[PDB]
């Protein structure tokens, strides 16, 4: 009985940890996507600048 209780507690702890880790990794992926979006926006602005500089 003692061993079973220990195992059950370990399982609950690990499950909660996996839930937290999944949420955190999803949030960080969202943040990376946002920063990539900003980089792409300024890169397209610079590409337009280069297109005009082709006439420069």
């Amino acid at each position: 009985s003692d061993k079973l209780k220990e195992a059950e507690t370990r399982a609950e702890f690990a499950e909660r940890s996996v839930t937290k880790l999944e949420k955190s990794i999803d949030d960080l992926e969202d943040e990376l996507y946002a920063q990539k979006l900003k980089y792409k926006a300024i890169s397209e602005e610079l590409d337009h600048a280069l297109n005009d500089m082709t006439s420069i």
Binding site: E22, D26, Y33, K36, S43, D47, L50
Partner: protein
């Protein structure tokens, strides 16, 4: 010719970083595919 070679390399690294951005976008897309598949399989596991 300095301006010519420089603008040439400028457009060149433009294209290179552009390909890299395309690859990274495809990476993000397959990433969201992975998010969706993990979500559905996790949800199935949780349902059972």
């Amino acid at each position: 010719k300095d301006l010519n070679e420089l603008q040439a390399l400028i457009e060149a690294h433009f294209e290179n970083r552009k390909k890299e951005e395309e690859e990274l976008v495809s990476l993000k897309d397959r990433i969201e595919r992975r998010r969706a598949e993990r979500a559905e399989q996790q949800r199935i596991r949780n349902e059972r």
